[model samples]
Target: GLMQFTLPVRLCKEIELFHFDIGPFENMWPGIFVYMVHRSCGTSCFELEKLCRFIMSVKKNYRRVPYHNWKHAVTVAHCMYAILQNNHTLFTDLERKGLLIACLCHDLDHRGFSNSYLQKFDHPLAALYSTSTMEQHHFSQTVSILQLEGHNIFSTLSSSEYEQVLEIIRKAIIATDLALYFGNRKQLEEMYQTGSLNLNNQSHRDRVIGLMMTACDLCSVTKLWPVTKLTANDIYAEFWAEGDEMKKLGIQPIPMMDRDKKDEVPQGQLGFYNAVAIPCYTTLTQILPPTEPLLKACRDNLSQWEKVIRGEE
Candidate 1:
């Protein structure tokens, strides 16, 4: 596959190795919502760093060559923060806390491969889990670590409170599936048409969570100048690298990679963004105006992707 040729496996492995050198996540409680995670989970703010480390450890186990790392998890965390900032009027304190925590740990142990590959291997983890809580199982697995002898993150919460938050977190995380992205986009459109600030609508909340994650995950267009450029190239390299892995696995390379002439880094991401992302994001910001910054980031990414695609990099 093109991705394998385009993105060296050594790069992915190197990143994985270097990931541990990065220190713990800072005090989450300093932020309004992050404080809530500690309060609800019955732990101190500093303890959240331990949970984050656990999340990072879980990510190491993912098999997917493209998006199985700290970058992806951090990207989702950034999205969760953006979503709350964009629509604070729509949520209560608890929902905000649950959503952010869920987003951060959603793909705790992603295998780099898509969900389809999990089913193919009849992986014990996948077989025991339902489609709606794949991420939840991963999330739960980390929380479970806390329960081991002296490591519980929920030591401060009552059993019922713990259960409740965990359930919400599970629901939000599982919603990140790519299959749901389009439907979620439509759901946001509907919410916008109705002009509602009702976050109590659990279904709606879940859908927005999914949409927000998707948008953030798709954010090549909305990053700081050089970071945006770097991200776009990395994404293209990952795509090509993954494409090659698919060939070795004897599976059909998904879409673009299969075609001999397909451009992994097409014209600075112009064709891909114009054709695939912009229309979606354009509608997305309309539904959630606070996402203007996110959109701007995307535009910046576009300029960078263009340079790389055209060999101007």
Candidate 2:
């Protein structure tokens, strides 16, 4: 009700739009995702317009930060959509819906500050959750936005279905935190290593969903080398901003965040590629072989970063 919006009626009828490569960040794509999920869920068009308004409202709430803006949100959602398309039958219908929405709302209302910043300043968010502070805020903000009048896209579902979907979204959002990625990757790797990954098992299924969220959250690293490098720069710019703020507040920033230590970025990125991006995609590909190309692309980018670290760039 605060910021009502309308969608092009024709787009609501074109579910095929969701199948596209999701070109440059466009504001309308989130609403298209809402339409796609609504259609896929077999929800009547009775309240479809409310879903559109909800997406726009969510988009409006995203702060204009260097890395965690609405564009980044759409990009993450697109990665999830692409992954679903690549492995259409891997996830249940309800899980597909939950994953997409979780991607859309995972970083809602981010204030361009890391969890460390919140904790360092004794920010109330840190006090409230104690762990995964920003992630908890993101999930809570998502629920708040959905609770707005005419914004309950899942209203048509049975009570059980609604509760189940909410649980899926909750885990998916929290799983985006990097801290959770190591544990998720380890579990998935052990499963695949032992030849024991049963997609039929609910625990295994949830593990896959969590890792998928991490893969999509860090999707930029799997892009073309140029794009990956540019995205890394943007993120570092945001980091530098955090450092600037911390310095203003008389706290020393971390090495990566300190503008004076910006030279460390190339090596820092190399470590991230080796430690986070490569391991993540590699684990995903082990479970879902079709995702091998994502791992390959990340490796390719890794090589480029290695060159930069060696001053070859």
Candidate 3:
């Protein structure tokens, strides 16, 4: 409860409001992620204008997809910010900076199509990555923004620090792909069970970050009841779009992705929470104590979904 209370709900609400073109949130948007970066990394190795422009260009590149667009991207980033806000010492300063930026651009230039869709159709992205397809592309887009003149936000960092930051960015971005989540989760489970999850260990920290990405990526499902429902609409909007396309291509979609199965959305949410979210958040709380509220938020959502399916809502 305290963790939920500590989250920047005002900022979260303002960002959500901006999604609908409501209130002063539009102006507040500029101050949001940029503020997070400044507070965490400071302006020592970052130029205010370059950092601002980098965010602008990153936002400009994220397509207007129903769920994978900039709005959703920022929510993912915001969840990460909440975690960092809750535990300022949870990660090193550089790690915090890289994590936030990686979260912000994790879905950059998403075309409202999934990796499966791309791979099945032999899209150029699939050809390039063949596995972890979209994530690889997202990393390159982040790199592209940095390559632009006056957009090199990390220009002042030493060459080694610059590479270290980008390495985190690249790895963090790729970790967002759900296919890798299983292995990431399993390794964390092993570490926790063996009581070997030392933040000081490079491998341990990297493994922890892998699960952190998925937890934030799916934070929508961990939201309060009404927001969760609203979030579902946006998700299925993209799923069904791709479902329709997949159907036309003679590929059958699973119930969660099928447009005709709209009534199953609640069940779909239940399945998703149980299959992925609960375990992911539960493991996070095991390894990182401050994430207890994250686990609670997810379990509360799971309860709501179960009640709805039983017609108790």
lDDT of each: 0.57, 0.80, 0.80
Residues 121-171, candidate 2, lDDT per residue (tens digit)? 889999999988999999999999889998887887789988998999999
lDDT string, candidate 1, 1-313, tens digits: 1111121344323212211111234222123233334433334423555555544444554445455555555555555665665575766655665666666566666655555555655567667775743565656765665455544445566788778767777666666665666677776777777886355777766776566667755654555665555555556555666567667678877665444536654553587677556756776677677676666666666676677676887
Candidate 3's displacement at residue 8, Å, is: 12
- Put the candidates in lDDT order, highest first: 2, 3, 1
Q: What lDDT tens digits, residue by residue, belong to model 3 across residues 139-210?
A: 999998989999987787789988998988888888899999999999889888998778889878888888
Which residue ranges in model 3 land beyond 4 Å of their true spot? 1-27, 43-45
TM per model?
0.68, 0.88, 0.91
The runs of at least 3 residues in candidate 1 whose Cα sits more than 4 Å from the true structure, single-residue gaps closed, are: 1-67, 85-89, 119-126, 129-137, 158-160, 194-197, 236-238, 258-264, 267-276, 303-313
Q: How big is the RMSD of model 1?
A: 9.8
Candidate 3, overall lDDT?
Answer: 0.80
The residue-level lDDT of candidate 1 at 209 comes to: 59
By the lDDT metric, which is better: model 2 or model 3? 2
Best by the TM-score measure: 3
